[PDB]
Write a protein that binds this DNA or RNA. Structure first.
Lengths: 207, 167, 125, 186
RNA sequence: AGCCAGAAACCAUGCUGAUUAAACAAUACUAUCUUUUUUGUUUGCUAAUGUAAAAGAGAAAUUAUAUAUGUACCGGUACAUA
RNA sequence: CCAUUUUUGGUAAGCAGAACUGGCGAUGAGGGAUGCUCCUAACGCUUGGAUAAGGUGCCUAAAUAUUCGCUCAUGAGAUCCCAUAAAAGGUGUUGGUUCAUAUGAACUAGCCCUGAAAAUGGAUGGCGCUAAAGCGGAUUACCGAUACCAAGCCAUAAAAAGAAGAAAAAAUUUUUUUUUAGAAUCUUUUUAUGAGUAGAAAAUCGUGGGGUUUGUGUUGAAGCGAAAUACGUGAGUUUUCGUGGA
RNA sequence: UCGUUAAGAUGGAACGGAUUAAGAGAGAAAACAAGUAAAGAGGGGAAUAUUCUCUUCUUUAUUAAAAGAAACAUCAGUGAUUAAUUUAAUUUCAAUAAAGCAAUCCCCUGAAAUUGUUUUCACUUUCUCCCCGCACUAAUGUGGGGAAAACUGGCUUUAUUUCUUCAAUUAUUUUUUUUGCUGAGGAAUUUUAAAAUUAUUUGAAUUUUUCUUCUUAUAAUUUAAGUUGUUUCUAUACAGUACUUUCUUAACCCACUCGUCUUGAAACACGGACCAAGGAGUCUAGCAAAUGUGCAAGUGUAUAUGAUUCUUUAAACAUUUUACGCA
């Protein structure tokens, strides 16, 4: 569904229900504005096959390749785990600096696009959620120190949704790795992190 | 036939005849603009205030656009005015219903052509209090027919350019 | 600056200090405008010393409200609870300073039973 | 900075509220304010204003003046926003139906005896809320004692007014400035 | 434009001060004491913390600059290079 | 009392006296280095915007901007009020113009110079500046007020307008939880407005006593000192801890 | 005012305002956790002093949640940016490759001969050639004298516009790239109604259409009809170094002795060493207007008498089982 005023054709998603605010005399009510929210409308440069720099992540400055635009309007990304160590991670649009280079214009890679697409199509936003019970399970450890950190990591790994994601991460990496690895300069470019210290005028989309 | 006259001078230190003419003109705030019907008495009134007001001929696109963005109307009673932004025809269809120029386009038409009912519509409209005039203003002193900069006095068609900046 | 908290804006930090009381020991610290006299500081010579006026006043909705979101009501006897109780949501108890400990304990306990916050109940032990 | 006279304020003059503490009169101005606002009748609006008006400046009406005024009215319902006073100077036979702010006891007794009606303002509101087929009356100001005292100088020429004078005695204010023989006259 | 000589004037020289520079150098002898590594600095006291600047804190001609620098010859000449 | 213009007396005067208007006084924010009066502009409390006067080498916020001229000064010159400089010169340079025979006259006005001396050390506000940061233009950009626009909030003014009913959430159709207004100088709502001495008004606040009411007291009052995630625009109120003993 | 201790500070003043900071202190009442099970303390109500049962505090652990702050997205209001765009208007062009026309000649622009046009000759290039100077130059040249041409340029054409172009400025318009700031409010008989837009349905239209228009009927939604959402975090706390907030120096910006009479006070005008307490528009008389209040052609019980008036009662009450003031 959409509203099409002035040719703009917005594209609408049903939004979740509102929090309630006091009425002038009796009780409280929901506000009625935008029960259909316009879609995310991401940067027009962005595409699935393109490799991008992770801006705020733990492994920030890594060059990681886009996977699925999720139904949350966030995106999934992987900087191939088996070679570069970067997981199949959820990330948001402004926190990822997309480069001009595209993976599926390399000759080997382009024949495995459908397999990548089917693995990608299966994943969604709900797979990545923290979950109150698991969140509590880590928290209840507070009441030596290194051991508890190890236990929390063990608990996250155990989770079936996390395990299912790691399976897909492994399968995508297994699918792409040999063909990427033979292309040594590209493999090195993937392994290599971002360059800028003082080298040139910052943040060009010539990159 | 019409002239848009914009005041462009403070309220301190006014000459007394000029002060009187300003009251009649209705430019009580220092960045007021208002439409005036050109006749002989109006021209002489404009002459008395001349170094303290800019003025010129307001083109039809400008007049509509200014009215759209800055249209307020007096919605109260005679000498108990209430200042309301014009966001529907129903308010002005009340006031100008007898005169049959009810609804904003008809008012715009009367402003454009110097129509059969000008005074009443003008009188019902608020005097438009305008923004400072963006890039390329300068030179508060004197008037525009000095070769040196300064928009004050008659600037004819070029009023629109100034209005576009201060919209 | 100013102190926003939720929909409660309080617009005045730094309560005013009477002019020249910094220099002279005799002049009382609590604010007085030099309204009764010519004084060349009511004449608004910039940066000399700021002075108050009505404009800083609280908004109509929040007018006397506490950050508790509840109006303060001062209590010196137990029976004064009884009309107050049906509005316990919008009002908070203050127990008066001058309350003898047996009575104070009784009032505190009763007020807690009546289910309204008492802001000085954690005092006079 | 705007150039408006009186800083753009509309400043109303005269009474802004009724300043009496009388419970009945406070109740009555509540009533007549309600009746004026809802009906939008001019009669009610006058009553509300006259009720708010200063008690001293509210007049007595003479019974002779009331009858003299009502003569061409075959409808009997007189309304008076003041006090109705009796007459001791004529027979005063013909009755009326009169609503007034206050009745002298003698006047009330005569009006009731004659077959008239002495009507409360609450009764008037109840029966005649629109004021139709009625007669609103005012007692006269008629140069009261202060009015006699004031009015652009008694000592100026070509003026008629009372100064301070204690003129019960004999040798009181009659000479220089009030006399054509001694200097000049007003 | 380019120059020159030329005064009891002017600045040094000379001479006085220089905790007027909250200035400084060299020499002589000396205070359990000095040096390297590790952990810490989350009763008046007796374990103990500070940075007006980190984040690639990277960078060796030289007179000029209405022409220079090398190199080869004898400040000069020749040949290169910016 | 001050300014412009008109103006009388007096050599003149920041002198005496006016006229018309506007200011200052009683009123300020920004500029004029600085400054009672010049310029811009008049002020509730705040946020954002865009400008004014005015600037944009550094002090000091914005251009070592652009564009065409002119200018070298052994005391250059630098913005109204504003804090000096004239007659008179100059074979210094720059434009003109009139004349005469690619040269000789004569004028002219721009700059610059001589004319141009004074008391603590001394002043374009200072440093500095001459391919200006000088003087005369023009071209843009930027910075630049509490004024102006947009928004919020406060109070005042005016205007509208008024004298009886179910909303949501938590649970697991049925239970629970939150809210559920009618004070006519009151409540809802809108729009406009906000300088201030002398001076007038209103709304408050606090102190001593009295009548009245319903409370506080020795498991500690008043008072006092230190304070308080405290309340009120404010005067102040309230409270905590410590003292204190009616 | 001064002592002790502690903390900070300290380059010819001092303190202050505006604004953050870092320290040092205080606090949990908004500044998280309803309920359930276990066992301690209370209170009630019903039933006929004690059986039943309803309730609130302490304690153990055990599931919720809500609240604010972040972050991005999405709107509406407001800006700033950098690309644009429509059909007109007004002595725009520039090339493209085939043709012509004249040779200082033409596009032009000069110079000449009552109140008209028109007619005359002046004016381009050259990396062409020659002659003299013969290297004389600022110069891969050069000064002077002549010739040459149409390469060069100009015009007339004929086609051509993505080879290269298609101006500028107005006029009416239509967008777009990044992005800054803002969110009052809360709609029990108007947050409703219409508009808009979408998917349908019916009739028209006209530039004829994938944002073409109206109205016929139907549903929804938002551009209508003033911010919402999602995910984080505080935090799985009980006050901690975090959070709140006082005090404290800092540093940036501003800030001249208050009161005073005064045209004009920071003044080389005057009063003020410091602190405490006391310390100044009142009361009576007579007059006035205003407003309240009672009565009214009257009004005011004056002096005074009376009483089961006789803690209060020194006023309160009454006016004989038709004085006086003012009107």
């Amino acid at each position: 569904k959409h509203y099409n005023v002035k040719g703009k054709k917005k594209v609408l998603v049903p939004v979740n229900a509102k929090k309630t605010i006091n009425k002038k005399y009796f009780g409280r009510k929901v506000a009625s504005k935008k029960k259909y929210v316009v879609q995310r409308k991401l940067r027009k440069s962005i595409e699935v096959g393109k490799v991008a720099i992770i801006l705020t992540g733990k492994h920030m400055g890594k060059r990681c390749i886009i996977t699925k635009i999720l139904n949350s309007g966030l995106l999934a990304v992987v900087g191939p785990y088996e070679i570069n160590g970067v997981p199949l991670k959820r990330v948001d649009s402004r926190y990822l600096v997309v480069t001009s280079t595209n993976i599926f214009n390399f000759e080997n890679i382009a024949k495995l696009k459908d397999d990548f697409l089917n693995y990608a199509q299966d994943i969604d936003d709900d797979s990545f959620i923290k979950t109150l019970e698991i969140k509590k399970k880590q928290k209840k450890l507070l009441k030596f120190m290194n051991n508890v950190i190890d236990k929390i990591k063990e608990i996250r790994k155990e989770d079936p949704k996390v395990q299912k994601l790691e399976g897909i991460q492994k399968d995508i990496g297994s699918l792409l790795k040999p063909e990427i690895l033979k292309n040594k300069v590209f493999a090195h470019y993937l392994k290599s992190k971002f360059t800028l210290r003082n080298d040139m005028v910052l943040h060009k989309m010539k990159f | 036939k019409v002239v848009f006259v914009i005041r462009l001078k403070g309220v301190n230190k006014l000459p007394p005849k000029v002060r009187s003419v300003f009251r009649l003109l209705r430019l009580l705030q220092v960045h007021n603009g208002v439409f005036v019907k050109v006749n002989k008495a109006t021209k002489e009134m404009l002459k008395i205030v001349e170094p303290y007001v800019t003025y010129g001929y307001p083109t039809l696109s400008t007049v509509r656009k200014l009215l759209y963005k800055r249209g307020y109307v007096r919605v109260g009673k005679v000498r108990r005015y209430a200042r309301k932004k014009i966001q529907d025809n129903a308010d002005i269809s009340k006031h100008l219903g007898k005169y049959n120029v009810h609804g904003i386009e008809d008012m715009v038409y009367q402003l454009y052509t110097c129509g059969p009912v000008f005074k009443k519509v003008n009188n019902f409209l608020w005097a438009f209090k305008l923004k400072p005039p963006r890039k390329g203003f300068k030179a508060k002193r004197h008037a525009f027919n000095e070769p040196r900069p300064g928009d004050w006095g008659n600037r004819e068609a070029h009023i629109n350019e100034l209005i576009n900046r201060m919209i | 600056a100013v102190k926003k908290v939720g929909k409660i804006i309080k617009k005045r930090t730094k309560k005013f200090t009477r002019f020249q009381s910094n220099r002279f020991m005799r002049v009382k610290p609590a604010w007085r405008k030099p309204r009764g006299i010519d004084c060349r500081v009511r004449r608004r010579y910039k940066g000399t010393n700021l002075m108050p006026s009505i404009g800083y006043g609280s908004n109509k909705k929040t007018k006397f409200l506490l950050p508790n979101n509840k109006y303060k009501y001062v209590v010196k006897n137990v029976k004064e609870m009884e009309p107050l109780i049906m509005n316990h949501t919008k009002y908070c108890v203050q127990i008066a300073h001058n309350v003898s400990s047996k009575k104070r304990k009784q009032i505190i306990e009763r007020a807690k039973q009546m289910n309204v916050s008492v802001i000085n109940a954690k005092a006079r032990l | 900075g705007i150039a408006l006279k009186n800083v753009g304020r509309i400043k109303k003059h005269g009474r802004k509220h009724l300043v009496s503490k009388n419970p009945y009169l406070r109740l009555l101005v509540k009533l007549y304010n309600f009746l004026a606002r809802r009906t939008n009748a001019n009669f009610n609006k006058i009553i509300a204003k006259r009720l708010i008006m200063p008690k001293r400046y509210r007049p007595p009406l003479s019974l002779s003046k009331l009858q003299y005024h009502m003569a061409n009215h075959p409808n009997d319902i007189a309304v008076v926003v003041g006090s109705i006073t009796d007459d001791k100077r004529l027979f005063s036979l013909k009755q009326l139906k009169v609503c007034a702010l206050r009745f002298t006891e003698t006047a009330r007794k005569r009006i009731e005896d004659a077959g008239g009606e002495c009507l409360t303002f609450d009764q008037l509101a109840l029966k005649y809320p629109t004021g139709k087929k009625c007669v609103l009356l005012r007692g006269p100001t008629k140069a009261r004692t202060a009015e006699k005292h004031f009015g652009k100088a008694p000592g100026k020429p070509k003026s008629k007014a009372r100064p301070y004078v204690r003129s019960k005695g004999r040798k009181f204010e009659k000479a220089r400035g009030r006399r054509k023989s001694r200097a000049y006259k007003k």
